[PDB]
Amino acid sequence: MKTIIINGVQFNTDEDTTILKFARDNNIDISALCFLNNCNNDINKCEICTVEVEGTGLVTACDTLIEDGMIINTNSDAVNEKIKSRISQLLDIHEFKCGPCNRRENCEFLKLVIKYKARASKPFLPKDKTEYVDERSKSLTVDRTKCLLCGRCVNACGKNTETYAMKFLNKNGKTIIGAEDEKCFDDTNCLLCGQCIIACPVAALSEKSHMDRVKNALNAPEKHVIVAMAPSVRASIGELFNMGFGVDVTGKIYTALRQLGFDKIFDINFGADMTIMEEATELVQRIENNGPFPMFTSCCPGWVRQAENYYPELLNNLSSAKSPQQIFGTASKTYYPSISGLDPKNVFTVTVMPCTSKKFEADRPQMEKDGLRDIDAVITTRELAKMIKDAKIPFAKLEDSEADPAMGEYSGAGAIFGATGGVMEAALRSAKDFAENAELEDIEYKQVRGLNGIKEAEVEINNNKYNVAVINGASNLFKFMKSGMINEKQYHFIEVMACHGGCVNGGGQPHVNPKDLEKVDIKKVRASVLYNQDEHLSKRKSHENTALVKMYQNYFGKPGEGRAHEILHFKYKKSAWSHPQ
Numbered sequence: 001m002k003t004i005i006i007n008g009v010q011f012n013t014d015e016d017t018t019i020l021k022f023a024r025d026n027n028i029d030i031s032a033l034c035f036l037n038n039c040n041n042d043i044n045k046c047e048i049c050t051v052e053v054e055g056t057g058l059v060t061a062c063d064t065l066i067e068d069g070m071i072i073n074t075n076s077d078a079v080n081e082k083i084k085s086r087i088s089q090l091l092d093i094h095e096f097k098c099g100p101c102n103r104r105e106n107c108e109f110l111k112l113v114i115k116y117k118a119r120a121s122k123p124f125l126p127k128d129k130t131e132y133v134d135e136r137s138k139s140l141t142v143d144r145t146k147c148l149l150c151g152r153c154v155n156a157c158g159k160n161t162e163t164y165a166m167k168f169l170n171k172n173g174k175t176i177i178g179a180e181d182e183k184c185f186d187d188t189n190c191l192l193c194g195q196c197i198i199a200c201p202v203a204a205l206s207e208k209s210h211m212d213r214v215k216n217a218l219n220a221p222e223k224h225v226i227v228a229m230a231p232s233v234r235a236s237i238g239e240l241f242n243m244g245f246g247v248d249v250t251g252k253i254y255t256a257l258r259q260l261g262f263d264k265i266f267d268i269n270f271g272a273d274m275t276i277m278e279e280a281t282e283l284v285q286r287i288e289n290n291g292p293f294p295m296f297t298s299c300c301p302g303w304v305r306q307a308e309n310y311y312p313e314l315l316n317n318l319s320s321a322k323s324p325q326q327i328f329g330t331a332s333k334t335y336y337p338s339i340s341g342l343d344p345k346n347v348f349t350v351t352v353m354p355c356t357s358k359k360f361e362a363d364r365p366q367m368e369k370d371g372l373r374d375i376d377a378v379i380t381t382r383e384l385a386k387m388i389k390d391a392k393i394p395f396a397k398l399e400d401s402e403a404d405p406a407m408g409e410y411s412g413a414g415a416i417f418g419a420t421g422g423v424m425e426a427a428l429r430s431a432k433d434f435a436e437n438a439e440l441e442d443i444e445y446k447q448v449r450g451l452n453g454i455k456e457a458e459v460e461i462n463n464n465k466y467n468v469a470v471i472n473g474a475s476n477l478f479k480f481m482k483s484g485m486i487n488e489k490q491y492h493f494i495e496v497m498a499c500h501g502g503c504v505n506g507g508g509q510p511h512v513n514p515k516d517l518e519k520v521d522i523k524k525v526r527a528s529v530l531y532n533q534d535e536h537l538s539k540r541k542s543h544e545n546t547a548l549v550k551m552y553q554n555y556f557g558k559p560g561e562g563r564a565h566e567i568l569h570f571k572y573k574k575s576a577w578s579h580p581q
């Protein structure tokens with residue numbers, strides 16, 4: 001073993017680990033900032049994790065290995081003055097104005113400033129933020145007056161996506177982060193997944209705000225504002241109201257949305273059942289036409305951008321079913337007026353998403369018909385939370401209410417969409433019933449669930465074997481393709497999610513501080529809310545959703561043909577030949 005003394009306390013251990021990790025395991029307090037995802041900022045270490053090792057001096061705990069004979073002090077005056085000094089140097093490049101800041105309630109940097117009682121040498125007070133701010137993107141925004149150059153976003157993009165779309169850049173002799181050549185992110189290979197935002201300790205990276213879109217529509221007397229939340233929102237937003245992790249707050253959200261003034265409370269899980277109707281029908285059509293195989297899901301816009309940017313030859317293989325968001329939106333401007341009497345032009349449809357990429361999807365030029373956008377606004381889980389708090393709605397004390405049913409009912413199949421493997425599982429439940437013209441009892445496909453990066457299964461559909469895969473994270477899509485796995489067998493149906501864990505880990509979700517991430521498996525705990533709902537629901541197949549069945553019967557007809565095909569689908573095409581390209 002080794003013997004280690006920390007702040008006068010002897011430890012016997014044979015672990016090979018860092019001082020930071022050993023301390024955290026033994027409830028010894030050490031601060032950290034740039035350390036995340038088992039990486040610190042290798043080209044500009046923050047040194048907030050400074051501790052003192054007798055005989056060696058000041059060291060960074062986050063990457064210094066424990067060794068036999070080490071005597072460590074984490075709280076000497078020399079340590080604290082060094083840490084304090086580093087925080088003071090960061091304050092010198094930080095617009096320290098927490099009042100209006102969208103990370104005020106959970107900012108890692110503020111907590112460190114308070115802890116060490118640090119102060120700027122010179123308060124950073126730029127008079128014109130224009131040059132520091134980039135709001136060109138439909139999905140992301142950068143405010144470099146808040147940027148600590150901690151590198152967490154650069155490392156998170158690399159690890160989560162392997163695009164390296166987020167880079168260190170040299171701008172006029174100064175270091176910044178940004179997209180390739182300081183372009184708009186949208187105009188680069190970036191997936192707009194927002195994992196970089198999720199990694200950021202401060203408010204430097206954010207979602208493109210849609211909050212004014214929403215407030216102006218609510219305030220317009222002639223606008224009728226529909227709101228519909230994603231699967232993942234009901235399993236996560238509670239975290240921002242100090243309710244802890246893994247709490248189902250579906251009913252509270254419906255009540256809060258009514259208190260915010262929305263005119264109709266629907267649910268994107270209804271749209272998820274629509275997507276399955278169309279997609280499971282398409283799978284059965286492809287089986288009968290013998291392809292094109294594999295069919296890929298098309299509901300994740302981060303993956304769609306990944307395909308567009310890296311694998312355009314797969315675009316024809318994507319399912320033509322719109323995503324639950326866009327397929328919902330389409331019906332909100334067509335079906336919903338037909339059962340309400342509203343003028344379609346006066347319907348304003350808002351979604352609440354765990355996702356930044358969804359904002360780009362919604363603003364795609366052709367995502368409209370007859371001049372009416374499918375989706376007029378997308379707010380993130382975080383934006384809704386702020387909307388609720390701004391309205392002084394006592395979220396944690398609200399009673400449960402229900403959604404308006406016509407486009408609000410959902411099956412258990414729709415409910416699990418937010419977890420990796422959920423779309424696959426939901427699609428199979430319907431494709432099997434469709435192909436075998438039957439009502440099977442065994443509907444649980446636990447083989448495609450969980451956090452493994454690449455998940456294969458063999459499935460039997462109408463007395464033949466088919467090969468499916470669930471790709472869990474954009475980096476795993478690249479692994480799957482580059483390694484040749486795609487070619488090792490004939491795949492027939494593949495789910496791809498850009499965010500590892502599925503949408504429950506999307507770029508629009510509540511931030512979680514590094515400490516809690518050590519203690520909580522956020523991906524499993526959020527997904528557990530969804531699978532729980534599926535278990536306790538009467539209808540667990542999309543085509544059994546009674547409100548959906550009514551809609552198709554009275555308005556669309558049969559899925560995958562006629563009107564349904566005409567307006568609930570959307571195809572992506574690779575660019576035509578040109579030269580130069």
Ligand code: 402
Pocket residue numbers: 229230231232233268269271272299300301323324325326353354355358417418419423503504506
């Ligand atoms: N559109 C749509 Fe989806 C549905 O339903 C969400 O809303 Fe997702 C979630 N939660 C998000 O963002 S997108 C990718 N498919 C899995 S779930």
Ligand code: SF4
Pocket residue numbers: 094095096097098101102103104105107108109110146202203204
């Ligand atoms: S990023 Fe944090 S420290 Fe900076 S202004 Fe916002 S809340 Fe305050």
Ligand code: SF4
Pocket residue numbers: 156157158160161163164165166185189190191192193194195196197
């Ligand atoms: S949005 Fe996703 S792909 Fe783009 S820079 Fe951020 S992490 Fe990378």
Ligand code: SF4
Pocket residue numbers: 146147148149150151152153154177199200201202204205
């Ligand atoms: S944007 Fe955020 S994560 Fe990226 S370097 Fe700046 S502070 Fe760190």
Ligand code: SF4
Pocket residue numbers: 192193299300301302303354355356357358497498499502503504505506507
């Ligand atoms: S996995 Fe979900 S949250 Fe992540 S980019 Fe795709 S749609 Fe958005």
Ligand code: FES
Pocket residue numbers: 031032033034035040041045046047048049050060061062063
């Ligand atoms: S947290 Fe250790 S160097 Fe940044």
Ligand SMILES: [Mg+2]
Pocket residue numbers: 039040041042063
């Ligand atoms: Mg390192």
Ligand SMILES: [Mg+2]
Pocket residue numbers: 217218219220221223225261
């Ligand atoms: Mg109104």
Ligand SMILES: [Mg+2]
Pocket residue numbers: 456457458
């Ligand atoms: Mg196998």
